[PDB]
Amino acid sequence: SVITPGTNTSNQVAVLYQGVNCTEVNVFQTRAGCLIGAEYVNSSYECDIPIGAGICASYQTQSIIAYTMSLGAENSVAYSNNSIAIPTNFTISVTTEILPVSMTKTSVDCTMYICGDSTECSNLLLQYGSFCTQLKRALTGIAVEQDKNTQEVFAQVKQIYKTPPIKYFGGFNFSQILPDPSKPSKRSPIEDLLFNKVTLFNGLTVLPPLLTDEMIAQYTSALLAGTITSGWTFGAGPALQIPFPMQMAYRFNGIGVTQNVLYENQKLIANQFNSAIGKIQDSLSSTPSALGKLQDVVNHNAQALNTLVKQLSSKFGAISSVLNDILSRLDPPEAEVQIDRLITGRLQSLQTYVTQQLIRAAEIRASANLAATKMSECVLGQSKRVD
Amino acid sequence: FNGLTVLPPLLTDEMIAQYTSALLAGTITSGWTFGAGPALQIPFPMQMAYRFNGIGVTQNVLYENQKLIANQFNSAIGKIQDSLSSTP
Amino acid sequence: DSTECSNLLLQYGSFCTQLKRALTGIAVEQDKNTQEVFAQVKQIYKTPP
Amino acid sequence: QIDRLITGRLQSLQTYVTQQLIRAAEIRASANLAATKMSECVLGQSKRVD
Amino acid sequence: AYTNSFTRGVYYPDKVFRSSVLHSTQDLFLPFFSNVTWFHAIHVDNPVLPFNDGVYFASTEKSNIIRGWIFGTTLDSKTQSLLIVNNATNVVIKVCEFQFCNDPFLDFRVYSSANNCTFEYVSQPFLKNLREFVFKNIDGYFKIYSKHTPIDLPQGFSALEPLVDLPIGINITRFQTLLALHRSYLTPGDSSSGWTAGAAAYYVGYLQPRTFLLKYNENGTITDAVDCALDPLSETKCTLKSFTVEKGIYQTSNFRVQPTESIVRFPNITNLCPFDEVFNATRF
Amino acid sequence: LTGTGVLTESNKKFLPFQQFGRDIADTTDAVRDPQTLEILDITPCSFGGV
To answer: Where is region (Disordered) located (chain E)?
Structure first.
């Protein structure tokens, strides 16, 4: 293995031979193997390049140093049989959690992908059975499942609640999340940042989604208006309007703090909430890999399709990859066994792709169920489940 | 073998035990609070009185049976190891 | 480590690339599971004497 | 005669990797459950029944 | 002598257009930063150099002192040798097993025995200027690549273009160069005295089977290349197919110590049967 | 080079020694006429599921 601090930082490199000791290959021995090119230092830091067995590596700053991980600072809280520590102030913060909900729906054409409209090849593929029926059914099941995931997550509210025109809620500033009527897409600014931050045949195809992006944004705005004007009630039945400061007082009671604490510090609380929402956008923009999960879904699908298309060029042992040449320069008895190899190989490739998609779809379904639960419990109400 | 390696874990069993010890010490001296922010120390009997209120039993029930409750807890913790060893 | 067999296996495509990638994904996932379960606390709290 | 060995050993290796993906998914579900129990039962007190 | 070859010797391998993409190819290339033999063009005459797999011939000259090559398994007429001779007007390519002298004649325009030509070809000529050539003969065809550039070998990167693909199938194993000189005497055999000539030199390098990562720009021209087996960082680049690798740890390949010897082991086997009794019989 | 598709006048600059054009994944995207040396683009005729 190669340890590297980045091409753009420096060309220096350290090499890790994993299951060997260099006595039988600077030099260093580790339980993970012997590491060459890095010097062992006694200081412990929060490690960033994981080597294994508690050893990590990082750029010293001018050399690559390996060191043992530090599990954080030691805090020896003062226990005593008669002492209590009680907080005198608070700070309300905002945390962003990202969750993938669905993936690209794909459909595949068996005969085209296998042998590109060749009569002799379809006549020869007819002997293998109903593999394509099975494959097509599996992919169709995945597609309908993706649609159900989006439905289950977002379409929880029954009526599209409209936002009132006078957007004053007692000092709280929701401008960063409510839809902006100026832009035509009607997405809030954070939603705009999210859409801009992430970006991205021979039989395959990418069937379109159902709920278009616009309708999903409409559902999200419905949830925001409901929760802003009626609190939890809109999730239990008829939406009952309540002034927003009283709603937050309700929630304060929910965490065991008497409401007089909110009415006496309304100004400070509103300022902290506005400031935190303002810093959220900057944090999402400056972080290089804040959207790692959604980006990973997109890239995985694209890479899968690319490798599936590239695998048509492989020969799999036949004298050539294009069907026409095989059928030109050889007699039918030998062309049969020369075309069997291509058929079976391409069929195996397509089979692998479908299996990978089933496993990944199970993964995304688990994630979508979690997302729906979070919607129900955190948005439509207040949860006492810890963390 | 013939090409099959078994790479080793990243956190070593000593560091995992250290993490576990951190959680135990935190929960023993500070209760739930250490999970929500700064760890605030509280006497252990008051922590258990809090939890008694949590299940709908008034805390006077704990202050009047502290001795008995502690004995029951110690005996149970002692029988756990024997149970783990005897179970096949 | 047979030359004729590597020469012949090279014709099959990128099956090995896919296999290596899948196993690497599993390994990194195992590490993340241990991290997520145990490393919840930020500071190593010590027990009083 | 070498084609057969190649294809057979490749299929065996392919089966092993698939089985490992399924088992890894199962263990990940279990690890998520363990983390949830940590958060809710150790770091607090849960009213969820049983 | 010796001199390190910089990032040179790369050539277009497949005459297929590609735009703004990276491509990895396994072919016979000249390893980067490898040393190459250096020879001078004054006088003596010139030694034969084997044609292992392909030769990279670069030359910095300003007087047209080097004018051609000769390939083949021998200089005698016992085998179908090859001839390539440039000139101010055109190139003459010939395959006729013409027997050569003990040394190639120093241009008195030709010196060889009779010929039995089987292939012949002609076209426009190949003309401080560093001229580079790559000679390859694998699939029954003999191929030439070339490039002539303005200007030791410079550090600048530049790829060679396919010049000619000839169909002659002679088994080439040795090669020599051809020199010339104005108003120089010519004899079938001469000592190391030679004749005066302009300052010039020619370098020789040997190609090897390598994996190269070639970078095409938007116009279909190679601008950069990475030797996949030069150092660990280059090898890491080859797996990610990217000139820029991010911070992290990458599993590039595996190593395995090779066997150093072969042994055969059979038993004390000793039980020869009686041939000494039927041949040395007492009485036939 | 054998294939099927619609040919349209190209806008890409082939270098004089090249005869084929390729996109990612070896899909033959363009060709120069071997008679008039004109560049031609290849696009597969329309197809799809019903």
So the answer is: 183-199, 256-272
Point out the residue among A317, A366, A386 whose CB comes nearest to the CB of D40: A386
Best residue in D21, D27, D32 to probe A by mutation, most A CBs within 10 Å? D21
Check: CB of residue E181 under 8 Å from CB of residue E198.
Answer: no
Handedness of CA E253, E254, E257, E258 (dihedral sign): negative
Q: What residue type is A283 in one-letter code?
A: S
CA distance F41 to F30: 4
Distance from the Cα of F28 to chain A's closest Cα (Å) equals 11
Instruction: Collect all residues with Cβ–Cβ distance below 8 Å to B3 and sequence separation of at least 6.
Output: E254
CATH topology of domain E2-256: Jelly Rolls (2.60.120)
Contact E91, E126 (CB under 8 A): yes
Place of tokens 């398994």: E73
Q: Which residues contact D27 (CB under 8 A, 6 or more apart)?
A: C30, C33
Q: Which residue has the tokens 């996932």?
A: C29
Are residues C8 and D13, on separate chains, in Cβ contact within 8 Å? no
User: In 3-state terms, what secondary structure has residue C18?
Assistant: helix
**Method by which the model was determined:** cryo-EM
Calpha distance E168→E144 (Å, rounded): 13
Which residues on chain C place their C-beta less than 8 Å from a C-beta of chain B?
27, 30-31, 34-35, 38-41, 43-48
Q: Taking the CB of residue E148, how many other CB atoms lie within 10 A of it? A: 11
Tell if the CB–CB gap between F20 and E16 is shorter than 8 Å. yes
SS (H, E, C) chain B: CCCCCCCCCCCCHHHHHHHHHHHHHHHHHHCCHHHCCCCCCCCHHHHHHHHHHHCCCCCHHHHCCHHHHHHHHHHHHHHHHHHHHHCC
In this complex, the residue of A77, A83, A386 whose CB is nearest that of residue B39 is: A77
Resolution given for this structure, in angstroms: 3.4
Cβ contacts of E220 on chain F, cutoff 8 Å: 13-15, 18
Contact A135, A110 (CB under 8 A): yes
Q: Is E15 on the interface with C (CB under 8 A)?
A: no
| Rg, chain C, Cα only | 22
Q: Which two tokens stand for residue E123?
A: 């076209």
Write the burial class of residue A73 (CB in 10 Å: 0-12 exposed, 13-18 middle, 19+ buried).
exposed
Q: Which residues of F touch E221 (CB under 8 A)?
A: 15
3-class SS of residue A203: coil
Asked if F35 reaches chain A (Cβ–Cβ under 8 Å), the answer is: no
CA distance C2 to chain D (A): 11
Instruction: Name beta bridge partners: E210.
Output: E27
Q: Does E80 touch chain A (CB under 8 A)?
A: no
Looking at chain C, which residue has its C-alpha nearest residue E254? C1
| Burial of A295 per CB tally in 10 Å (0-12, 13-18, 19+) | middle
